[PDB]
Amino acid sequence: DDFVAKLQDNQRFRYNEVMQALNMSAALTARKTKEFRSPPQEQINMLLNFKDDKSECPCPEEIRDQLLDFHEDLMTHCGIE
């Protein structure tokens, strides 16, 4: 609940800054808004690729760290050291 709520708020914010303006050059609009043009399943899938260090996801560092801590706690509970 908390993770997806903060993710949704930050995604709305990122949307706002994405379509503020590109007066310098507007050729990058397609790549900048392909995120918001992808359907929700792929949206969450690519928002959730901060595992490992590929780091192509637009997820911010604090939101990444929250799940990185929750996953370690869950693995400790599951008994995977």
């Binding site: 918001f36 043009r37 949206q43």
Partner: peptide
């Protein structure tokens, strides 16, 4: 164009669906 804009981004979806 219009098709992908008329697709609501993840933030518009109700929170339980996002969960």
């Amino acid at each position: 164009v219009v098709a992908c804009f008329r697709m609501a981004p993840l933030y518009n979806l109700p929170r339980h669906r996002a969960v």
